[PDB]
Design a protein around this ligand. Structure first.
Ligand SMILES: Nc1ncnc2c1ncn2[C@@H]1O[C@H](COP(=O)(O)OP(=O)(O)OP(=O)(O)O)[C@@H](O)[C@H]1O
Ligand SMILES: Nc1ncnc2c1ncn2[C@@H]1O[C@H](COP(=O)(O)OP(=O)(O)OP(=O)(O)O)[C@@H](O)[C@H]1O
Ligand SMILES: Nc1ncnc2c1ncn2[C@@H]1O[C@H](COP(=O)(O)OP(=O)(O)OP(=O)(O)O)[C@@H](O)[C@H]1O
Lengths: 132, 1030, 66, 235
């Protein structure tokens, strides 16, 4: 098939329903590189590192065999664009959306992220292919 | 093989008679018709391709002799011709047959050639008129039949080949331009008109430098082996008769009192050398630089009359090489070897050139080799590259004699000495191409008519020279600066130096510095440059001092650096300036040139102090055409290929074409391209020789090879600049593009196709913004336009342009815009530009970084709209409202393209058919039904997701069926062969083959859920209403 | 990589001292010499480099069409 | 000399719009010079901004600093003026009209439908109209005058084996093989080989385009500009 496979799916539901575990566990079952990530670890007080942090995460992901990415409390990392007054949140959101628009290498890396609050995350990400 | 040759006056296609001995050595007996190739000697390093001629046995011809029609070589034997040729007998006589051929006939003859009712009649004409024969007669390209009336322009698959009437494809034409009228064989129209036969005592004749060396083979009479090769001058036979002398004789060449003695010979035909002239090697031309014409007078002095020498004193001629202490030993070593070879003939106030392998200099191969027997073989292991000049300050004869000029040198009987250096203005290019004669890397020749900037520089150099010779001194200073590297600055400096015959002083401050930090650095560098320049310059004026990448030393250190280093750099700058001033003051008639890749770096204080400025631009279309003309020259092509067979290119190469697809390229790129085409041609030739057994005489180059090379060069250029986000996309992978197709095409291609119409001092198309509901696929469309149009695409994503500190982001903006300007025509893409469009306010971008970034954007956007003939910006964004209104203005954006939802069933039908292009869909599929079911909220992303789910369901079916295969076979055969072994060995192609059914897509459609709310669709419709109704 | 090495990405300054035309110097000199021989003879000298990454290896060799 | 600062709203806004205060110290630096009485008056300072509200009031003190210039909407009169100027513009390269200009068309009715536009919008309208004319011209000659000069290539073929047009092409390259240097072309009666845009084309183009600004933005910016000018009057 010359078709990019479905690799990004979002997690949401009742708080404390187990999504965190299932996310952590599926790695061993399938067997892959689960580069876990902590929401606040990406965002950095200082500009020029947040986008750099996400970029380095993606370079890690590709540089290893078909990998698994997970983002916890996904609502925080990607808020609805524009509302932020600092602008860092919007630009990191655009970076994250863009990194699914890369030409190649996206094969084998599967993006995952859990948040009970799907409304705070801009729907531009739910574009099937990024989070279908 | 070495055999004698004779010429027959008969027609062009008279069979070549082969002496019985030649044939009988290996020629087959029952062979129907014999053919044979023949290779001639050539007065030039390039060995011309050997013609293939039909041959006929004979016994009359002596041992190893051949008679061939001189008409086959565009000439008749009216002049003493070449005696012998190299012949090769072909085995198996696998002679190529020409698919087609192209004659050339005049209008008057053409009319009476095709006025006939039938067509076969014409065949007979030639058979009667030229005696051609099917599968027998052999034709070649450029072959001439009737003087200025009938000629062979070319033959297509092979410039030479066999002809078969029933199969050959003959094409012929009338000449309206009357090209044939001016075409006649060599020495054909020049009847025997003896100009004052053997009457005048001495004449005045043009004296020309030899374009190339001469092998000892081609000298009639056979010169004495011990004789001095270096005193041989050539000329046409008729001139020799005019002065009633014989070849290999001795004659005097002189002017205004100065005289020299030279041998003389004759150019055995064939040859294209200018007639009624005397050629000589640079040795003699050196002593008469200005004198274009010389006085020629027979010499009544024989070899025996020459008096042996007693003492000879020689002064090395001033030159950049002389100061090269790393070279000194090899120079005099070569001189001693050269003199030891044989007895040389010289005079008072003469100059001697010595060539030598520079790369071989650093191996002091001692002389313990008593008269090394194989001098020739060490020489051929050498390929001389560097030339020098040795002067003869004085010499003494042993025998008292009235002759105070001429004498001879013995290897041992004579005694020599080398003394102080002497000055001498080197010869200009016009009088001789020293580079070509010995065969170095021939510097690219320049036609200042087409390169006005080089005219600019050479207009300064000779003016300064004249001022100096006028008793006038006005120091000059020229700096070469280019946007890109490898534009030829150094090359054009070198050419200008050679053209005016000015000694070349040149140093690359990028190479030999050997020290850049130590506080002694400045002192070391300045002292070294001063030492070399004052060491060589005083005896070498006029000359030019050249600094390569001079900027790499001089620059304007930023205040953001430690002070003492700034002080050191200020010092070195000042002493450089003082050095140049002192050199010009102390050495009148002296100048220098500097090369720099960017003006902004050199100390402004220094720049102001200089005189002249010039930028060498990237080659323009005509410049590219001429540069190709040069590189595609055969002589320069085969310089560095010792392989016996030469190389060449079709005559059907549209150089203008290549020039058209060489936009923005540079000389280095041109060399890459040409040598790469040589590559592909040579590889294909060496494969063909194996394939068909018979070896084509030469190697050929074809247009498609250069097309491939230029495509590769464009790919490499992209690699250098990046542009990786272009894997592959085509219009057939997408659908529902109808209306926007017209906009995109008109905006992008139409200016590219016909820029002249828009080249009217006019504000051309600015940019195309792409706004629409998510999932429509503006990104796919951008990638499609990038890949399809095959243009320089560089995407700059907004978010990845910021930086820790404030200001460098805008530095990247400026530099990327400039770099795109270089790579014109260019497409620059900004993706989700809205990331940098929150307007002022305590609730938006408190800090103004985005404001300065959008200032970059708008500023460079208006700047480009003036002279950016080739830049195109495409805007991608899901929400345009957040975007800065400052950008929506025309000049920045005129086409606010709306990539809307597919609302007509037509759009989604097109989308589906595009998506399923590679799908293995079972006949049960009904795309029209799916188009019917889908509401008008679907997007390209939604259709892609639906098709992906359907394929996944089909794959689930296949995977389950393979699982059942494995499980059941685990019991039937008892072999628990895990699915892995099946995937490696038992998962046949059909199992791997993916087959899908309508129900898969239908079930996914029932499971399908759009990815956008009707509320968001209405919001985007509200955006569209205000952005489309006005 | 270790001899004609890169100037490291993000040196710190937009264009540092002579843009490292202090350490790439040797590559330029070597390529100049080798090309001087090459155009003078083809079958003699032929270089074969080996590095960790194309980006890592210096670009001048590419920018001089090596 | 004239010095000019574009986007001064992004240069020296009102104070209290920066955490590090670099804007503020920069602003006092700028003020030092103009307020600095050092005979520094030959330089003619100038600046532009679409958001003058964002600038510091001190940078607009009467007497301390001079008048400010407002730019108003191009109405019928101004629209006609600009349209006539640009359409009748004499070229730098050629000297004739930048566009194939209708000699005495009804430029009056064009301004009527452009109420609320901007001079940039007017010139963009005319520019895309010129493109529509260019496309019309290219279509007009799509299969009208597709032929080069001197088609006289007399020849005949035997055993052609169906290579007619390619035979003609090879004949052409073979005959034109020699004398081609740069362009071998003179000014072959340069008669403004362009397209005059039809009035209907101009009207439909005016329909196609919209002003760069929206109703709400236009209203708010006009209001703030009026309030600013009233402030400069002492209000
Ligand atoms: N069938 C089940 N599978 C997995 N976990 C289960 C199941 N039933 C109950 N749980 C429990 O649900 C708990 C929920 O924890 P978890 O942090 O994973 O929740 P969550 O809903 O993903 O929350 P959060 O988004 O806040 O991280 C787990 O600790 C797990 O023990
Ligand atoms: N017409 C031409 N103009 C310039 N170079 C040419 C031309 N024809 C061939 N060349 C080749 O282009 C190359 C130019 O290399 P050169 O080292 O002189 O570069 P440069 O552009 O002068 O500057 P730099 O030192 O920055 O590379 C040479 O190999 C030269 O033979
Ligand atoms: N004809 C089509 N044009 C564009 N995309 C299409 C088409 N057919 C299917 N698709 C799919 O629709 C999706 C749109 O992807 P694309 O990245 O181009 O979106 P976009 O609208 O530019 O949005 P984003 O802002 O997320 O980049 C992709 O999965 C693509 O494969």
């Amino acid at each position: 098939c010359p078709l990019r496979l479905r690799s990004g799916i979002l997690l949401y539901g009742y708080p404390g329903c187990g999504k965190t575990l299932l996310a952590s566990a599926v790695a061993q079952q399938c067997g892959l590189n689960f580069i876990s990530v902590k929401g606040p670890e990406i965002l950095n007080k200082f500009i020029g590192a947040s986008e750099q942090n996400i970029r380095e995460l993606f370079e890690r992901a590709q540089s290893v065999k078909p990998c698994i990415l997970f983002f916890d409390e996904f609502d925080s990392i990607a808020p609805k664009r524009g509302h932020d007054s600092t602008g860092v949140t919007d630009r990191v959101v655009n970076q994250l959306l863009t990194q699914m628009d890369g030409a190649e290498g996206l094969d084998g890396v599967y993006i995952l992220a859990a948040t009970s609050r799907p409304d705070l995350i801009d729907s531009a990400l739910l574009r099937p292919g990024r989070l279908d | 093989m070495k055999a004698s040759l004779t010429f027959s006056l008969s027609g062009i296609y008279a069979p070549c008679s082969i002496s019985r001995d030649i044939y009988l050595e290996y020629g087959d007996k029952k062979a129907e018709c014999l053919y044979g190739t023949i290779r001639l000697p050539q007065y030039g390093p390039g060995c011309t391709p050997g013609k293939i001629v039909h041959c006929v046995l004979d016994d009359s011809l002596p041992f190893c002799s051949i008679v061939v029609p001189s008409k086959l070589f565009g000439f008749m034997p009216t002049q003493p011709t070449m005696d012998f040729c190299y012949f090769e007998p072909i085995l198996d006589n696998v002679v190529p047959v020409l698919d087609s051929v192209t004659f050339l006939i005049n209008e008057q003859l053409y009319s009476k050639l095709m006025d006939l009712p039938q067509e076969m009649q014409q065949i007979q004409f030639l058979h009667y008129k030229y005696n051609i024969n099917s599968m027998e007669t052999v034709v070649h390209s450029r072959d001439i039949l009737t003087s200025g009336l009938c000629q062979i322009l070319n033959c297509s698959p092979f410039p030479q080949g066999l002809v078969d009437f029933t199969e050959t494809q003959l094409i012929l034409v009338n000449d309206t331009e009357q090209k044939l009228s001016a075409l006649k064989y060599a020495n054909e129209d020049e009847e025997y008109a003896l100009p004052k036969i053997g009457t005048n005592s001495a004449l005045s004749i043009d004296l020309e430098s030899l374009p190339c060396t001469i092998s000892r083979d081609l000298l009639r009479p056979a010169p004495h082996i011990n004789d001095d090769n270096s005193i041989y001058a050539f000329t046409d036979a008729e001139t020799l008769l005019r002065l009633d002398v014989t070849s290999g004789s001795f004659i005097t060449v002189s002017n205004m009192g100065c005289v020299r003695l030279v041998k003389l010979f004759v150019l055995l035909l064939p040859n294209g050398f200018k007639k009624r002239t005397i050629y000589a090697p640079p040795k003699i031309i050196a002593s008469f630089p200005d004198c274009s014409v010389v006085t020629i007078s027979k010499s009544n002095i024989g070899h025996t009359d020459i008096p042996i020498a007693n003492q000879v004193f020689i002064s090395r001629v001033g030159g950049w090489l002389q100061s090269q202490k790393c070279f000194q030993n090899i120079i005099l070593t070569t001189l001693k070897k050269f003199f030891s070879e044989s007895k040389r003939i010289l005079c008072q106030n003469d100059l001697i050139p010595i060539a030598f392998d520079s790369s071989m200099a650093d191996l002091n191969i001692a002389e313990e080799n008593d008269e090394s027997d194989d001098e020739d073989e060490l020489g051929q292991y050498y390929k001389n590259d560097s030339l020098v000049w040795f002067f003869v300050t004085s010499a003494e004869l042993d025998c008292f004699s009235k002759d105070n000029s001429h004498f001879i040198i013995d290897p041992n009987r004579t005694k020599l000495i080398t003394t102080n250096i002497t000055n001498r203005r080197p010869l200009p290019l016009s009088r001789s191409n020293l580079q070509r004669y010995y065969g170095f890397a021939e510097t690219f020749y320049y036609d200042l008519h087409i390169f006005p900037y080089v005219r600019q520089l050479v207009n300064i150099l000779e003016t300064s020279f004249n001022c100096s010779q006028r008793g006038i001194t006005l120091n000059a200073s020229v700096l070469l600066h280019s946007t890109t590297n490898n534009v030829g600055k150094a090359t054009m400096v070198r050419f200008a130096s050679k053209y005016l015959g000015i000694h070349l002083l040149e140093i690359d401050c990028l190479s030999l510095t050997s020290n850049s930090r130590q506080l002694d650095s400045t002192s070391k560098i300045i002292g070294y440059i001063r030492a070399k320049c004052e060491n060589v310059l005083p005896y070498a004026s006029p000359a030019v001092i050249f600094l390569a990448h001079l900027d790499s030393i001089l620059l304007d250190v930023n205040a953001n650096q430690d002070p003492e280093a700034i002080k050191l750099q200020k010092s070195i700058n000042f002493e450089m300036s003082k050095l140049l001033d002192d050199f010009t003051f102390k050495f009148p008639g002296t100048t220098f040139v500097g090369s720099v890749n960017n003006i902004d770096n050199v100390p402004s204080s220094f720049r102001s102090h200089m005189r002249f400025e010039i930028l060498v631009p990237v080659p323009s279309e005509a410049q590219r055409l001429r540069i190709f003309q040069w590189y595609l020259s055969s002589h320069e092509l085969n310089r560095d290929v010792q392989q016996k067979v030469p190389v060449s290119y079709m005559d059907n190469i549209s150089f203008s074409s290549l020039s058209s697809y060489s936009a923005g390229l540079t000389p280095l790129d041109i060399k890459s391209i040409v040598e790469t085409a040589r590559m592909t041609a040579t590889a294909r030739f060496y494969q063909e020789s194996k394939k068909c057994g018979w070896l084509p005489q030469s190697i050929l180059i074809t247009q498609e090879d250069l097309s491939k090379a230029t495509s590769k060069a464009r790919n490499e250029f992209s690699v250098s600049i990046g542009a990786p986000q272009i894997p592959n996309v085509t219009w057939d992978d997408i659908g529902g593009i109808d209306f926007v197709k017209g906009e995109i095409l008109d905006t992008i291609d139409m200016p590219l196709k016909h820029p002249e119409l828009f080249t009217s001092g006019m504000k051309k198309r600015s940019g195309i913004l792409f706004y629409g509901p998510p999932g429509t696929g503006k990104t796919l469309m951008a990638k499609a336009i990038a890949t399809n149009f095959s243009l320089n695409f560089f995407s700059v994503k907004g978010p990845e342009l910021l930086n820790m500190y404030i200001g460098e982001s805008e530095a990247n903006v400026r530099r990327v815009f400039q770099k795109a300007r270089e790579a014109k025509p260019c497409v620059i893409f900004f993706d989700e530009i809205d990331s940098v469009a929150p307007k002022r306010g305590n609730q938006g971008d408190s800090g103004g970084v985005m404001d300065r970034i959008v200032s970059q954007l708008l500023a460079e956007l208006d700047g480009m709209s003036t002279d950016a003939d080739g830049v195109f910006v495409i805007g991608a964004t899901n929400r345009p409202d957040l975007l800065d209104e400052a950008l929506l203005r025309p000049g920045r954006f005129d086409k606010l393209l709306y990539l809307g939802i597919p609302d007509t069933d037509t759009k989604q039908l097109n989308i589906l058919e595009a998506l399923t292009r590679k799908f293995v869909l079972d006949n049960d599929v009904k795309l029209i039904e799916l188009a019917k079911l889908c509401p008008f909220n679907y997007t390209g992303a939604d259709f892609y997701a639906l098709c992906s789910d359907a394929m996944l369901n089909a794959m689930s079916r296949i995977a389950r069926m393979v699982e059942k295969k494995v499980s059941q076979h685990n019991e039937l055969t008892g072999e628990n062969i895990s699915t892995r072994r099946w995937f490696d060995k038992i998962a046949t192609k059909e199992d791997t083959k993916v087959v899908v059914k309508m129900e898969d897509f239908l079930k996914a459609q029932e499971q399908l859920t759009p990815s956008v709310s009707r509320a968001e669709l209405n919001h985007y419709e509200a955006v569209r209403a205000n952005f489309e109704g006005a | 990589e270790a001899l004609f090495g890169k100037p490291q990405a993000n040196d710190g300054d937009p264009s540092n001292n002579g843009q490292w035309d202090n350490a790439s110097k040797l590559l330029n000199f070597f390529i100049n010499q080798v090309t001087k021989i090459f155009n003078k003879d083809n079958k003699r000298i032929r270089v074969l480099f080996s590095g960790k990454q194309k980006t890592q290896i210096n670009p001048l060799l590419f920018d001089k069409h090596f | 000399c004239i010095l000019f600062f574009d986007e001064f709203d992004s240069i020296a806004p009102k104070r209290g719009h920066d955490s590090t205060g670099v804007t503020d110290r920069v602003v006092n630096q700028l003020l030092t010079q103009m307020d600095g009485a050092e005979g520094l008056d030959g330089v003619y300072i100038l600046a532009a901004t679409s958001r003058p509200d964002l600038i510091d009031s001190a940078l607009l003190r009467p007497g301390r600093l001079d008048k400010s210039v407002i730019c108003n909407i191009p109405t019928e009169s101004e629209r006609l003026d600009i349209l006539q100027a640009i359409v009748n513009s004499k070229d730098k390269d050629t000297g004739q009209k930048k566009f194939a200009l209708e000699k005495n068309a009804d430029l009056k009715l064009i301004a009527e439908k452009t109420a609320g536009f901007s001079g940039a919008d007017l010139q963009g309208l005319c520019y895309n109209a010129y493109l529509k004319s260019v496309h019309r011209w290219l279509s007009a000659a799509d299969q009208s005058e597709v032929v080069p000069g001197n088609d006289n290539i007399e020849y005949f073929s035997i055993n052609e084996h169906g290579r007619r047009e390619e035979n003609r092409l090879r004949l052409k390259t073979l005959l034109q093989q020699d004398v081609v240097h740069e362009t071998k072309t003179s000014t072959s009666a340069a008669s403004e080989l362009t397209a005059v845009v039809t009035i209907n084309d101009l009207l439909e183009a005016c329909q196609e385009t919209k002003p760069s600004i929206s109703t709400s933005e236009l209203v708010k910016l006009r209001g703030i500009y009026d309030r600013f000018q009233k402030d400069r009057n002492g209000e």
